[PDB]
Nucleic acid binder design. Structure first.
Ligand code: CTP
Ligand code: CTP
Ligand code: MG
Ligand code: MG
Lengths: 437, 437
RNA sequence: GCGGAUAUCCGCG
RNA sequence: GCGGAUAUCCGCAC
RNA sequence: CGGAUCCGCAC
RNA sequence: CGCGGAUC
């Protein structure tokens, strides 16, 4: 073991190299030179300004302060104007309010506009509370900016860093707040092992209490959950990972897992041995950002799942993959084929009228009474899950999320069996089916 | 073809002919003759006495009237003595107190001991009511015996005459009580179309009312429901027939529906086109009466159905058949085969102690978290409905009804597909599957 | 965009 | 029984 | 009191 | 499971 030998070991893996530091430190100096000239207000916030970023996650967040007496467009316009005319490379994003994401001296940079604001109960735009976070954090974070790095690394290598919808994990700000609250990666990790789905972590009041859900109170605004977009499953994965760390520590907790990657042959035989219907719904990925695509991929996956559920194909698990040009909604069902015939249900024997209407209909098999009710044998539209999803996708594309549903209306495909294993989804399947090596 | 004429022609199918009527009359006289000289008290009751018996169903009922100071042991002993000593050939059967069945001059007779009783207030056995039933109906039935005969014939033709557990229909008594209420067959049929599962027919008060469920109030003991063992499905089945009749009457309603009987090859094709799984449990028939066997057959049929439903084989319908020596429980299932793997479900993530226990267990696949709970993949014991039941019948003969389960304990089989259609159940499978001719 | 809550319409029953 | 659709208020993505 | 089923009650 | 009631 030797936990602190492992902690020191992990430091060199998580702390950015001298070349990196100065690399961004040279892009920071130049970025100032170009703004100071254009004369508007700015502050550096985030993982760079507080000196908390990871080794290899060098991005610079620069908010622009704007007068209280403005309008949404006068922000959107003046901000996006500055970005492109202050960075070498540039593009666009559509979050809360559209912002610039550029590259200066080879270093990625975000540029968000927001309101100046006196004290943070005005909450005019929600991104208005970001410089306040910096204010509250700097100096309170001093001497601990390595314990923050250690945590972010611990997460990043277990896919639960980032509060983006691609992840639903811990935001960088939440990592900083935890280290303030507990005072050390390790004190955070130990205590986490007893975190519950109803744990409230009031940083400003230095107390843990019971609540409605897992709430971390923002010390800048008390009615804001810093951990709001952390999924229940990911909190569950973190709590367990801490337990498993403490109980038997290792350095491997800080190294990302390399994918499974096995023969299209072995995978074929696992499905053969599980006896399940495993299939994917392929289509062209829409041209939108991650914060937009992923929540949709999730809805699409849920809606089809609930279909498989409803039509009694008894699905096991679902998964998705976004790739270069394609997307893949992946499913595993316990029922490969279902009987053509099924039960309809009619009116109670009493209801004289609906009964003559129910028995009027033309059918291959004579109806019958059961527990004072008419029932009838009818034929299903489709007989396998694949045939079912193929029908559902065509008729219910609109309900599978806006941008994704429209990309299905244009083109979609059901791929199953040995054909499936030829697509770039092998790791996402083994993950899903819970394959060990 | 004009209602009123059809009833006329139906009478011929329903009324005992010249020969049969005085076949029993000569038997009635020798029975009086043999009883009188034993100086014992008796009344003739039932179908014969009130002269409502159906064609080909000639049976004398004689209740012996013992003074109410005897003992459930004396009238029991004396009753058999007189019963044995008055019939040509005799059997003994047990229902209330054991009584004597047999023959007099080629006519089937029942000789039942019962207490005389002055009032229908102190009723200490079901058989004690019969004298009073007759005393109430006699004379109130005169002028209407053919109308009762019609009603019994209508029911008998559609397999819902008899209150015995084998049928769960309308008793002979109930039919008479209906004709006394509605005055005629037809006025019964007309008005029956508006019976509900809550209808209450108090004959003594000559009022129809709304209660808790279908309840025909015994005029002799108004706490008794004369319609007690009429099923809901046979109440419905009748209520529907009357409607179907009135609307378009025919003699056809009074003749029995001769069984389908189709090629063991066309039936093979149906199960194919339905894509269901059809099988039977076959076992040696226990040696007990029908009112013991059928209730159990129902229970056994239910428990195995419930199993298949619980186990996710999606059962469609069930039926049973009781031949001379063997019994057959029949099932149709929507799932011919389910996957080997299923999901198990463990503790919520927070439960340290129980997660450890749950995650140590040896498995072929990595368990996973979902909605804050550990779930794990596992292997099913059986994978087809046939295998499933074999497992279930072996382990759970206990539950499938006392006498029946004991025979299933002894020996049972599962016959399915090509092998099944060779058995004597062809007629019950079709009805269950609702196959038209 | 996604999720929740409130209000309202369409469909298979 | 559900399966969709539409508006307003809320919350999240930085 | 020979019997089996079904519903209510306390578990 | 066990008891009570109803049912044929
Ligand atoms: N889900 C989020 C993301 C961001 N922020 C605010 O925006 C700042 C910068 O955002 P971001 O780049 O996403 O996080 P960083 O703190 O910069 O950490 P990192 O860059 O390593 O992700 C945060 O410090 C915080 O004040 C927030 O409150 N909630
Ligand atoms: N559910 C029943 C069945 C029968 N009985 C009584 O038992 C008598 C005779 O029984 P049974 O021979 O079985 O029927 P029958 O009424 O004589 O006519 P059938 O045999 O044609 O049905 C009837 O008069 C009736 O009073 C009764 O009280 N309740
Ligand atoms: Mg940052
Ligand atoms: Mg009789």
């Amino acid at each position: 073991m030797k936990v602190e030998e492992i902690l020191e070991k992990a430091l060199e893996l998580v702390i950015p190299d001298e070349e990196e530091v100065r690399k961004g430190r040279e892009a920071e100096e130049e970025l100032r030179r170009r703004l100071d000239e254009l004369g508007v207000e700015y502050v550096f916030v985030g993982s760079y300004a507080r000196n908390t970023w990871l080794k290899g996650s060098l991005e610079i967040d620069v908010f622009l302060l704007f007068p209280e007496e403005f309008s949404k467009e006068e922000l959107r316009e003046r901000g996006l104007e500055i970005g492109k005319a202050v960075l070498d490379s540039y593009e666009i994003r559509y979050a809360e309010h559209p912002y610039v994401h550029g590259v200066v001296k080879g270093v990625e940079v975000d540029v968000v506009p927001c309101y100046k604001l006196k004290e943070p109960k005005n909450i005019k735009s929600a991104v208005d509370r970001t410089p306040f976070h910096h204010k509250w954090l700097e100096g309170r974070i001093k001497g601990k900016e390595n314990e923050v790095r250690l945590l972010k690394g611990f997460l990043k290598a277990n896919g639960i860093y980032g509060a983006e919808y691609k992840v639903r994990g811990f935001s960088g700000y939440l990592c900083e707040l935890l280290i303030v609250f507990y005072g050390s990666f390790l004190e955070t990790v130990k205590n986490a092992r007893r975190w519950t789905r109803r744990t409230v972590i009031d940083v400003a009041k230095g107390e843990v209490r019971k609540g409605e859900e897992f709430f971390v109170v923002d010390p800048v605004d008390e009615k804001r959950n810093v951990a709001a977009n952390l999924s229940l499953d990911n909190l569950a994965r973190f709590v367990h990972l801490c337990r498993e760390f403490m109980e038997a520590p290792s350095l491997g907790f800080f190294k990302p897992k390399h994918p499974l990657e096995i023969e299209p042959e072995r995978l074929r035989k696992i499905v053969e041995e599980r006896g399940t219907a495993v299939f994917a719904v392929k289509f062209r990925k829409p041209d939108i950002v991650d914060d937009n695509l992923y929540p949709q991929l999730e809805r699409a996956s849920r809606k089809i799942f609930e279909f498989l559920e409803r039509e009694n194909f008894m699905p096991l698990r679902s998964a998705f993959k976004a790739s270069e040009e394609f997307c893949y909604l992946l499913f595993e069902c316990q029922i490969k084929e279902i009987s053509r015939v099924f039960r309809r249900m009619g009116p109670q024997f009493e209801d004289e009228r609906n009964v003559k209407k129910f028995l009027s209909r033309n059918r291959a098999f004579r109806p019958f009474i059961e527990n004072g009710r008419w029932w009838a044998f009818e034929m299903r539209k489709f007989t396998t899950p694949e045939e079912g999803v193929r029908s559902y996708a065509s008729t219910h594309w609109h309900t599978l999320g806006k941008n994704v549903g429209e990309s299905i209306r244009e083109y979609f495909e059901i791929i199953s069996g040995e054909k499936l294993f030829k697509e770039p989804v092998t790791a996402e399947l083994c993950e899903m089916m819970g394959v060990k090596d």
